[PDB]
Amino acid sequence: MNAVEIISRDIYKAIDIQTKILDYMTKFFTDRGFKWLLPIMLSPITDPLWPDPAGEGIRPAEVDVYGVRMRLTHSMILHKQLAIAMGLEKIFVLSPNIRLESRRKDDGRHSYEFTQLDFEIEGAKMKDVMRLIEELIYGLFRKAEEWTGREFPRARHFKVYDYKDILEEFGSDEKASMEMEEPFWIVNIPREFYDREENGVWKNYDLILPYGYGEVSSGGEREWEYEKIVAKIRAAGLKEDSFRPYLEIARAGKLKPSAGAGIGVERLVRFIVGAKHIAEVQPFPRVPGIPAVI
Amino acid sequence: MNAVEIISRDIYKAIDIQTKILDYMTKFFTDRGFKWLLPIMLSPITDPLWPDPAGEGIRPAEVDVYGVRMRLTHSMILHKQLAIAMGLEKIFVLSPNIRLESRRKDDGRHSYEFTQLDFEIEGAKMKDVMRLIEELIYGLFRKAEEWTGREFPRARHFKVYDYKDILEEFGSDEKASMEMEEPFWIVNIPREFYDREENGVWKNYDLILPYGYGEVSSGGEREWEYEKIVAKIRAAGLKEDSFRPYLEIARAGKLKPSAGAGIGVERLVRFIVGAKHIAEVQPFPRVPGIPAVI
C-alpha cells in the first residue's frame, strides 16, 4: 500500500469511536484522582521486555543524544515506578511505545508503534488493579452499546486462569482467546524483573479479550527492593549497566511498593469497531516487519 | 541533575495543575466535535523546522526500522495535513516531539522532549484559528484563577503585531515578551514550506505569553498545491527526497486547504505555576544540550 492508498482508506467511524474511548478512559482516571503525566520517548533506561512468554527478546532501538546512547521507549514501566518514588501516588499516561518485532508477530493485534494508557498506584495489590480494570471495561462496554447499537460482553465477572492452567487446557493464550465469549484474566506469568515474585508466585495479570482478539492489558505488583531486582536481572542475563540510574534509586531505598497496568488503546478501538486487523483503525499503519511508507 | 536528585524534587503542585490543564484542553476540543488521534513517533518524513527564525536548523534524530531510515517526530504537521486528507475534518493529538536543539536554546521554555496539543481544521482561516485559541486561553485562565487563587491576564482577545514590526520595535520576540503584560500575537513570519504564503504575506501566527515567558503556540493556514509546495522546498535548499510520500499525495491533488496550530502543554503548565524554568514542571527534565540521566 503506497502513500495515496493509505490515505484513501475510510477510517472515520473508527476514529469517531477512538475519540469516545479516549474521552471515557481519561475521565475514568482523572475522576479517581489520578495525575495525568506526559510521555517520554528517549531515555538511558527502558523496559527490557525480556524474559517474557509474549516476546522475541528484541533490543530497543537506540539514538545518539548529545553524544549519549539513548533507548527509544519499549514501555514507561521504569519511569512509572520513578513517578511513584517522587510521591505522585496515582499516575497515568497516554504513552507511545516502539517495539520492532518481526513479521512473525503480524497477527492482527500487534503494531510496531502503539499507545498504552499506562497507570500506576502506590501501595496497590493485584486484586485492586484487576478490580479497577474490570470496572473500567464494564463501563466502557455499556457505553459502547449506546454508541454502536450492538451488544458487548456483560463484563461483571471475569474468570481467572493461572498461566499454567492456560497452557494445559488450551495450549496458549491465543487459543484460549478464540474459545471464550467473555473477557478473562491470565495470572502468575514469569516475565520481566519489575513484576513482583513471591515464593515462585508472580503477582501479575493479563486481560484477554474474547473471540480471538487477544491480550488488551497487562500489569502487576512491582519489585522495589534492590537485592531482589538485581538478582532477577543477573539471572536473566541482562546487563546491570543497562539500568544504572534506576538501580541507583533502588539502592538508595527510594522505590515504593506499587501496582499498575497498561491498556492498549488501539486494541480496544479494534475490538469495539470489530476490525479484523488493527491496521484498519490506524490512520498510519505500523505493521510488524513492514516499514511504514508514511 | 543526577537520578536521586531528580526524583527528590517536589513537583506535586505542578503535576496537579497539568492534570487540570489536560482535562480542560482535551474537553475543549472534543466538545467542539474534534476527533482525538494518537501520535506517531517514527516516519520517513517529518517537519524540517526550517526555514524558521525560531530555529538553528537542527537535523531530526534518526533510527532504522527493518533496515529503513525513519525520522523521530520533529512535529506531526505533515501527518495533520494527511489526516485532513483522510476526511477527518477537525482533529487534534497530544503529540510528543523530539527536537535536539543546542545549549543556545536553553532559555527556560525549550525542552528537547515535549508535547504539543496539535490540531487542524479543514477549510479554516487564520482569523478562525486565532479566535479559537483566544477562546481556549481565556477560558483556561479563568479556570486557573480558581485552581490557584492567583490572578491571570483577563484579555478576551489579544493584540496582533506583524513579525517585521516586532523586530523594529523590540528587536526580538523575546524582548517583546518581556515588555508585555498580556498575551499577544505575532503574525506573518517567513518559515516552513507548509505555512500558506500569498504575494509575500504569510498566513501564520504565534501566541506569545507576557512577562518574558515567550511563545506558547504556533500555527498557520497551509499550502496544499503541489507546484507551490515543491517550489518552496527547493528555494529553501531542502530536498524533495525528504518528503517523497507526502509529495506523492500532494501531486495526486489530495491535500485540502486547512489551518491549525500546536500549543505547548508544558509551557502552559510553567506559566500557570510561575516556574522560572520549564524543567521545574517536568518529572524527567529534558534540558536542551544536556543528555538526561533518566
Ligand SMILES: NC(=O)C[C@H](N)C(=O)O
Ligand atoms: N509490558 C508492559 O508494557 C508493562 C505494563 N504496561 C505494566 O504496567 O506492567
Ligand SMILES: NC(=O)C[C@H](N)C(=O)O
Ligand atoms: N512548529 C510546529 O510545530 C508547527 C505547528 N504545530 C503548526 O501547527 O503549525
